[model samples]
Target: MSFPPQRYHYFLVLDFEATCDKPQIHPQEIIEFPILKLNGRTMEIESTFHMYVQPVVHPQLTPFCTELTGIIQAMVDGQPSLQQVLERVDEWMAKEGLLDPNVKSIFVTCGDWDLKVMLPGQCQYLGLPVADYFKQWINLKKAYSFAMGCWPKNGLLDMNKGLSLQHIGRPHSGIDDCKNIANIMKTLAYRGFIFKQTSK
Candidate 1:
């Protein structure tokens, strides 16, 4: 079930910074999530979700993560656990009118693989079906791939650079990246290729 132009109020844009091992397993085993809301039709950022979710497993830091992602143990320590945080996030979405049932909700991301990795444990934690929130993501990565007409666009960061998006600081801070991504999507929407939402 996809949405018409009017139904979806926003495209939820989320970014994650995860714990790493060699070959960098899922970037999100010890994951932190932040979301920014973009009006799907107007494609403007109108709200956000930002939090450091305490990992259910090994809720501690590894030297590898600290060095690479700079998400030190001290950083996440004592933060609200994922359970507490995601609940707050859901409440915020509802209060902000992003999750209104009158709207057709569509989850979107730069990559399908990203939400794939993050959603399972999160839904299991929150007690919801994973697919309902993620699996069938509107794939920005795939869409970009198709638009570029190229097989090797490097990675997510590389693809954004290819579009000449303005650079910002800090990879993992949720709000910063959320805003940056909103701008990028806004640009895409402004062009003939994209648009905002409207649903009855």
Candidate 2:
């Protein structure tokens, strides 16, 4: 069994962890950025990239944020900045051959939060452009809805729960989340599903 034919050359599964404060004291920044590069046909992870980023504005991890994401201040201290991490990601993709002109790829995420919220916010904060590489993506949660027999709007946990699959890792961990999303994506692919539809 292989990934759906003529779909994509590769799938870039992404997840981000960021600082958060409800009162908006300082806007959140991506503290963790991770990606899983998977073969489109086999659904096997070909490579992975992960990095911690130092926030220029806040410059510290909040207690609540640390508790939620299990990311410590020490981990991000003296780490690369958001722009630097983005550049590294591009380099990694290039090395993995996913950035080749003949390769068609799509970023797959649990939701739009990684692409729509955290990434753009970080780019704007650092005066960086949201690169064209991120223009196409798949919201796995939305796909889960269609694949799970037309189930209602579902989050990662909810969708996996409904599928009777045990949670593999703690929630909110970027790499863990990215890997789990790949597992679910493989399941859907084996079922002869295609990303032809989307949820509202």
Best-matching candidate per lDDT? 2
Question: Which runs of model 1 end up more than 4 angstroms from their true locations?
Answer: 1-7, 23-30, 121-131, 172-175, 195-200
Clashes of each: 12, 0
lDDT of 1 by residue, 1-200 (tens): 12225346667877667776666654356356777777777777777677665665667777777776767776687778766775787788778775666765565565555566566765665576543444445666555555566543644566568678775666645556566666656655555344322111
**In candidate 2, where is summed lDDT lowest over 10 consecutive residues?**
191-200
**Cα lDDT of model 2 overall?**
0.81
lDDT of each: 0.62, 0.81
Candidate 2 wrongly placed segments (more than 4 Å): 1-3, 22-25, 151-154, 196-200
lDDT tens readout by residue for model 2, 29-126: 88889999888877889888999889878887778888888989999999999988889998898898877778888889888878877787778877
Global local distance difference test of model 1: 0.62
